[PDB]
Each structure stands twice: as structure tokens, then as C-alpha cells.
Design a protein around this nucleic acid. Sequence first.
DNA 1: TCACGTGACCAGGCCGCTCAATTGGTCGTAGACAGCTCTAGCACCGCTTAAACGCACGTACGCGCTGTCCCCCGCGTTTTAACCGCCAAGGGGATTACTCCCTAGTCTCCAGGGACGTCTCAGATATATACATCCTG
DNA 2: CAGGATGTATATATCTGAGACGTCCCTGGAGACTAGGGAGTAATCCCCTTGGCGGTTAAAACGCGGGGGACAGCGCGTACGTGCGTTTAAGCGGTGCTAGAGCTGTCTACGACCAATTGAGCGGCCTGGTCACGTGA
Lengths: 92, 92, 97, 104, 67, 67, 91, 95, 82, 78
Amino acid sequence: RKETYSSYIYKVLKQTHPDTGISQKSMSILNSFVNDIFERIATEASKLAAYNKKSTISAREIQTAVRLILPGELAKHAVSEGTRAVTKYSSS
Amino acid sequence: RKETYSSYIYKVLKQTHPDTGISQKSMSILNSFVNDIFERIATEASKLAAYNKKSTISAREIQTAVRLILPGELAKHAVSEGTRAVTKYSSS
Amino acid sequence: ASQSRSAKAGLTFPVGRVHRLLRRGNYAQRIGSGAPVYLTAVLEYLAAEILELAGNAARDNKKTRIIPRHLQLAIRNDDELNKLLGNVTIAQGGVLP
Amino acid sequence: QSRSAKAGLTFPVGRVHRLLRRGNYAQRIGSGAPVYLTAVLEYLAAEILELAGNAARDNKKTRIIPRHLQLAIRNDDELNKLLGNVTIAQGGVLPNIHQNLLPK
Amino acid sequence: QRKDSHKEVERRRRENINTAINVLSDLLPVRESSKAAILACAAEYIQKLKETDEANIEKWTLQKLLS
Amino acid sequence: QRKDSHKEVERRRRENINTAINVLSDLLPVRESSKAAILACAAEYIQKLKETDEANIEKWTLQKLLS
Amino acid sequence: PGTVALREIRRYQKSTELLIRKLPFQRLVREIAQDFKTDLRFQSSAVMALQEASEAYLVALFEDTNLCAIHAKRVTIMPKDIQLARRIRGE
Amino acid sequence: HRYRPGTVALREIRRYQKSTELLIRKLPFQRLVREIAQDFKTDLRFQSSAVMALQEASEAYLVALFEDTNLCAIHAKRVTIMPKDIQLARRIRGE
Amino acid sequence: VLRDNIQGITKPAIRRLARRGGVKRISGLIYEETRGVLKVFLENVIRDAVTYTEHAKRKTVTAMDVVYALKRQGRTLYGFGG
Amino acid sequence: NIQGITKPAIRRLARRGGVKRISGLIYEETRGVLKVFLENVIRDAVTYTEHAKRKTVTAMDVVYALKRQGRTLYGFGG
DNA sequence: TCACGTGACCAGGCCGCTCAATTGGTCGTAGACAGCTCTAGCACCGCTTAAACGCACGTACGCGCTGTCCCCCGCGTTTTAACCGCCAAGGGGATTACTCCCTAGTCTCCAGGGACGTCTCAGATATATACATCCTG
DNA sequence: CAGGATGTATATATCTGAGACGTCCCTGGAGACTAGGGAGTAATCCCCTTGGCGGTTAAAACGCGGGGGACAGCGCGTACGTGCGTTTAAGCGGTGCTAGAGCTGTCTACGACCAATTGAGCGGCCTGGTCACGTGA
């Protein structure tokens, strides 16, 4: 049983363009993009933890990895979304 | 208590040249070189083990990694060096 | 009753899968509670941006679907994604006019 | 006895075993992997040291300074490409004057 | 054998109508997916133009009468 | 068995488009040609209505600017 | 002379299909791999992936070569242009 | 006495390709570095080692870029480097 | 087991690649140069691809092997896996 | 500021590069290029510094920035 | 000519299930925060002087224009082999299962390598001269 | 093409920090034992790789003439180089001072582990939504 983000790209796509569809190869490319950025951020977080002799990868690590991995405005929006999601998670 | 390869680099130098010395900056450069090559080989070996669904980084992972990382003649000679070392270790 | 983490954070990407990949991937000895949520929100935002730009690119044409061509156009046209994906080759994407 | 000597090396096999274990590369590090890596690293160190010492003698010096390391790396066609993306402090540059700039 | 002739004339018919419909959609990009959608958009546009024209003529008449 | 539903929906849609173009032709009594020619008529008439609307807007805006 | 060169140019740029023939590329790839391990087998998707990579690389190298040719105040690309492109790009 | 144009240039090339020292002034470079850093966080302190690593990286980068610029100028049949040459080098290298 | 294959990258194929890059005129010597460049590139990628293949003890070179070889060269590719 | 990177400095760097004569306009272009390079590296240096809860920029931060950008620098404790 | 039965292509719904996600509790440790030492980064200063700035004079080359001609491009014709489908066999990767030996974890112990001190000599500064290279007439 | 002018390469005392060596030590690697979890080997099996045969056709290959664009040459007019004088800041060594780097230590909160329960989501069967075509009067 393969693991993919296909269902999640469907759900995210229909939100902005309900009537638009996605081709199979397009879904493959999008999955590869998601996995690539995941690996980039995870590696940078691992390096950040290693440099500070720290054993835990936390939200600060992901935030700094995003600041390092994405360009200016895109990184700003990513940081905003991450902080918002973390806040919504903890608030209860 | 900072670790370092200074003593080992110095001994390897003297194993072939009786009187040549290494300044502090050259010593740092050689140490950083050794650490950089360590990181390259180890990261490649970890990726190889992950790709093959293995939880163990063995000497064969290091052999494939050294072939990928190093160029031709260096790869061949380093492979021979590693195999002799491992054979002498296992035989005794 | 049970509630998925993505539902708590208000996300569509699976927090659980990302968290499993974070521990199992040999990135660190311990993984914090808030790492998966931040990471998943970031990934979701980037995917949404790709999808919006690609939808616009396909709407420039009359096509009803996104084909690799439109992903290519979306990535190259925008300076942001172009810098981020400067070394990424998209199969069947070709080149811009 | 020392495991480095047991395998006929000089570099710290046990130190490398600890580095591989705790450096977040895999759940398990095999016994022979640190030995292999130590041997390969020792060979590379020996090669670069030999070339740099040759450069120092060719310059009538007794110590290796970053200039000699740069000369050793950039003159060697393979030790160069292994380090083509690396800059070395106080290394300078190899002499290179294009023929089209020569007098007459 | 002559049925092939009917075939390419039908193909040309389909091509021409599809080209015209594409011209419509380029004129009215509101909806393009389904023929019914294009027709509905064009019909709404035509009704809007007719109402606006009636209003414009009637306002011009008042403008002329008052000044 | 399953064929019947599919063909009935196809019939429903195609006759819906037919009746849609029929109501348009009732709103567009200028060509009364065949279906493809009538679609061409719709295209051209919509184009000319748009251009006529913009032209009347421009010319009467000029008249307003005059006074 | 060159009037339909631009026709070909924008025709190919607009499209997104392959340009090198398939079987020749497959045979070249097999011959190349033979020097590394004989009796080797290739997954078809692997061959297509190689073809996509190679076409992308050649297209990019040719854009760089064209920039070099224009820099030389020329419109024809010549071997020294490709050489300059590769040399600058670290290859 | 007066050397013909070009002799001193080659002499300088030989001197600076033999030598290994830094070429930009240290205090002006440090001032530039601090001015740049002012736009990311206010009141940053800098280690001497950090400033020196920055200067070494910058000098090596500029020297390599000028080598490519010289190559491009020669390809253009000239002997002088012009801003078009730097632009071509940077465009091909990907920046 | 065959030779003369590098000639399979015919003149028109090189022409089409050049035009897609925006070249509007080419010389006759470009064709051998581009054949050589493609040969070097393909050897360099297939080296690593076959390395990844042999390591896993497999007789078939999988598309993922090509994907990771290209990534290791820094030329990541989206569409065939990963 | 940038003007402290004088014309003779650029000439010296280029001579180490290998150029015989220099266009009068290379100086401004070189200043711009160096400013961009410095900004790009210093951003990541300050990012690492901020992450470490520090307020001093350390040589390892610069080394990490350079290693990140594919410009590995040996000789400063990396 | 007008108008219409039917099938590629696809989205979505729905269920089976099944395999990882969520929940709850226990136990240990890492890192947070408080606190202390004290390194070095920063501010200012005076003095020596090496590099920088500016301006002057000249000629070398970047550039423009103008010619020659060669070799590339477009197009007509022959041919060749790619490609599409379609059918065969098989070998090689994906998978399941079980055995067992290799490695992670814990405990004890002590010498291998790091930190700190002191010391002389290899390199730097300075000086003297020997041959080389360049530019003039 | 010889001769002078500047320059780079060769051969000597003084000194001086910075490599290099001896010592204290302390902590991390080596020896021993363990338990189970991954690696490894064997057997299955089904996909998908290779191989072959024909026809059709697209594409490639070859030839031919006519530009037009590469390449070479001559004239020139300024932009860059080189050089001398003035001056501006860098560089250096010193003195003070305090922010903040680095380390220690309780001491809590949080993350790893296990067991348990269960819902998300993959896959497959199936129903409608869509365009487009071949058919008949």
C-alpha cells in the first residue's frame, strides 16, 4: 500500500477551484514537491538541533528552517501559517 | 573538552615525512577537511540504508558511499584501503 | 469520540503521518509536539500556492485540468517559486515562450 | 589493545564509531562501518598531506601552510574535483595568465 | 464509399462550431466547461446589454427634453 | 441495462442545449439558419452588440464632455 | 534564410513533447551502461527519466550557448560558445 | 622612464597570484558588514573570526567571478572586462 | 551490445533542441560537440544509477535509481517518482 | 559603507583574477555584486545567531551560511 | 442537406478493512531558568605611513564601416527505420516466513588524548648584491 | 638589436612567538554479559522486461542554390593605463569597561514506550456527468 498526499492535494485544490481537475502526472509532480520540501526542512532542522547540542526538533527548528529554505515573502507567509496552526492546536 | 584529529593527522604526516610540520591554520583546514568528508560519506551511507529499507549502516554502505562521493582513482584506492583495514580487523 | 490532530489545528494535511515521518526519519533523538503542526502548515501553504498559480496558468488556456505544462508555467513565472525550485526539472514541462 | 592498532590504522576508530552512533545517521551502526570509514579518511588525509609536503619542499619550507594545501589540491585533477566547491583560507590562487593577454 | 465525404463534412462542421464556441468563451470567459454554461452566460450578457440599451436611450430622451 | 440511463441523460442534455439555442434564436431572429450557422449567428451578433454598446458609450460620452 | 527558423523556434517552445528519438536514446543508454555492468536491465520509466533529464540539460545548455553567441555579436552558435558555457558553469 | 601600457598589469597579476594575503581593507569591510547587518537585527556584535570568514569568502567569490569575467571578455575578442561580462558570467552561473 | 549509437542523436534532433532554446542559426560543428556533451552527461548519470542498482543487489536499473542519481548531481527531477 | 571598497581594491582582486585592463564601470557593478553576496550570506548568519538565542555573530554561523550556499569555507573552525 | 443513438473519458459515492493514529498512564531526563565567572568585543585615543585620490599626457584598442566569400537554411526528392500493435517466454523483484547472531544498553575500570606550561628555532625583518626583462633610439 | 633602469631572485644576523614536548588528569573507550530485533537465506509468484514480425508512416539523409552573416582589414578617436604629488584613512599598541559567552545545577515539564481502542484512507465496484463521433431521412 503506497503512501501519498493525493487525497490532500485534491482537498486543497477543490478549495480554490472546485471545478478544476488534476492529471495523474501532475499529482505525481505535486507529491514529489511536497516530499522534497519536507526533506529540506527536516534536514535543516536536524542540523540546527545538532549545532546547538540539542536533542529535540521543536517548532523553533521548523520556523528557522523555513526562514532559511524559502525566500522572503513566501517564507513570511509560511511562518504566519505555522504560528497560526500551532496556536490553534494548543488553544483549547 | 574539544575533540580534534590533530594528533592523528600529525602522526600520519610523520609516518611518511620525518620533519615536516603543520601550522595551526593548516591544522584547522585539515581537520575541517576530514570532518567534511566524514559528513559526506556518512550522509550518503544513511541515505543508502534508508533507501533499501535497512536500519543498519554497514561497511558496504560505506563502500557504495565512497564510490559515489570520491572520483575514480581515489575511489578505487580508498576502497582497497578500507577492505584491507576491515580484513585485518576481522581476521584478528 | 476521537478528533484528528489536523482537525484541531485546522489543516488538511495529515499531522500524524508527518509526525511519524519525523521520528522515523532519523532527524533527531526526540521530536517535539509542535514540530509536526508547524511543518504540516508550511507544506500545506506551499502546496496551496502551487495549486493556485497552476490553476491561473491553466485558466490562461481553456484547459479544465492542470497538466505538467501549467505546473511548469506557474513555477517559472513567479520569482518566488522559481528561486525555490531553481534546480527542479518538471517532466513534460518544457520551457516558457 | 586499541582497535585502531588492531586494524592497522592511526585514526581513532572508536571515536568514529561514537560519531556514527550519536550523529543521527541510523538506528544501528555496524561493527565494520567505523573501521572502513576510518581507513578511507586516513587514506585521504595521507594523500593530501603527502602532496602538501611535496609542495612545501618544492618551496623550501619545513611547515605546511594554507598556500601549500591550496597548491596540492588545485594541481591534482581528482583531489581538486573532490574539493571544487571549497574555499581555503589564505590559499590564494594558481597562477593563470591567459595567452591572449601576453605581450606582443 | 461516399460516406467518408459526409464524414469529413461533419468533422468540419464540428470544428467550425467548436471554434465559434471557443470565440464565445474568449469573449465571455465566465464559464467555459459545458455548452449549457456558455449559452447561459451569453444569454445573460445579451439580456444585460438589451436592458442597458433601453435605459440609455430613455435617459438620453430625458436629457434632450430637459436640455 | 446501464446503457439506458446514460443515453437518457445524454438525450436530456443535448435536447436541453437544443432548446437553449432555440430560446436564444427566439431572442435572436436574424439568421434562422441551421444549428451550426445559428451558433455562428450568435457569435457574430454578440460581437456586434458589444461593439455597438461600446461605440455608443464612447460617442455619447464625447457628447457629454461637450456638454 | 532564417525566416522559418523562428517558426520552428516558437513552435517547439510552445509544445511540451520530446525531441530526441526514443529508440536511439534507449540504445545509446544501454551501450553507455554496458561499460559499468554487463547483462544489465533497464526499467522503461528509468529510460524515459533519463531522456527527460538529458533533454532538459541540452535545452538549458543551448540557452546559455545562445547567450554566449549573442555576447560575441553573433547569431550562429559555435563550439567555443558551448565550451564557454560549460566552463563558466563549473563543468 | 615610463612602462608601456600592459607591463604593470601583468606584473600585478604575477604578484597577486603568487601572494596569499587579503586584498580588501579590513576596517572598511567591517563597517560595510555592520551596516548590512543593521537591517536584520539591531545591536548585533560580531566576532573577529566571523568578520574574517566573511571577508575571505567574499574575496574568493569576487576573484572567481573576475576569472569568469575575463574568460567572457576574451570570448568577445576583447581584452577589457565590461559590466556586460560580469552580467553574462552571473547569468550563466545562476545568480 | 552495439556501437555507432552516439550517431543516433541525429542532426534534426540537435536542431530541435537548439531551437527550443532560442537559437536561430547553428554551425556544422555543433553536432559533434553536443553529441560529446550528451555522452559525458549520460555516462556521469548512469555511473551513479548503476551504482545504486548494484548496491541493492538488483539486475534492473529502476527509475528511482535515475531519480536519486540526478538528485545527487543536484539536478532533481519531478514526475517519475520520489 | 560600500564606497570604502575602493577602486584599487577591485583592481587588486581582478589582478588576482587575471584581467589586464578594466572598464571604468566594473567598479560599481562589483560593488553591487558584492553587496548582494554579503546580504545573502549575512541573512543566514543572523538567522543562525537568532536561533541560538545569541546576540553575537560567531564564525561558525558564517561557516554554516557558506556551507549552506554551496560555498564551504575551511579554516575558521567549521 | 438536419438531426440524432451510442461509447471514450472522468468525478464522485460508497463499502471493506486494516493499519497506522489517538488516548491514557508511567517513568526518566533535558533543558529552562536562575546564577556566577570572566573573555573579549567595543569605545576611544595618539602616531607612523602606505595606500588612495586627483590630475596630466599619450597611444592602444573598441568600435564602426566595408568588403569577400562560405557555409548554412529552405525545399525537393529518395530511403530508412521508428513506431505502433500484438503475441511469447521467463527472470527478477516484491513478499512471507523463520532462524540466530549482532548490536544496543549497562557496568566497571584506567590510560589516551586534551589542557596547560615552558622553551628554542624556523621564519620574518632587514640588508647586501646578481642576473633578467623591458623599452629606447 | 645593444645599452640603461627598474625589478625579481639570490645570499647573510637578529629576534621572537609559535609550534613542539613534558606533565597532570579525567573521562570516554575497551572488556564483559546480556536480550531481542534486524539481517539474512529460502521459496513463491506474478509483473514487466526483453524479444520478435509487419505495415505505415514520419522522419532522416542527400543535393542544390542563394543569401546573409561569419570573418578580416583599415581608420580613428577617445578611454584606459601609467606616473607624480598630496592627503586621507588604515593600521597598530595601549587602557577601560562592561555585555554577554560559557558553564553549573536544581527541578519541573515534556517526550519516549506500551497497551488499548478505533477511525482515516487506500483500493475496488459502481453510478451519473461530459464531449465527441457515425448514422439516416
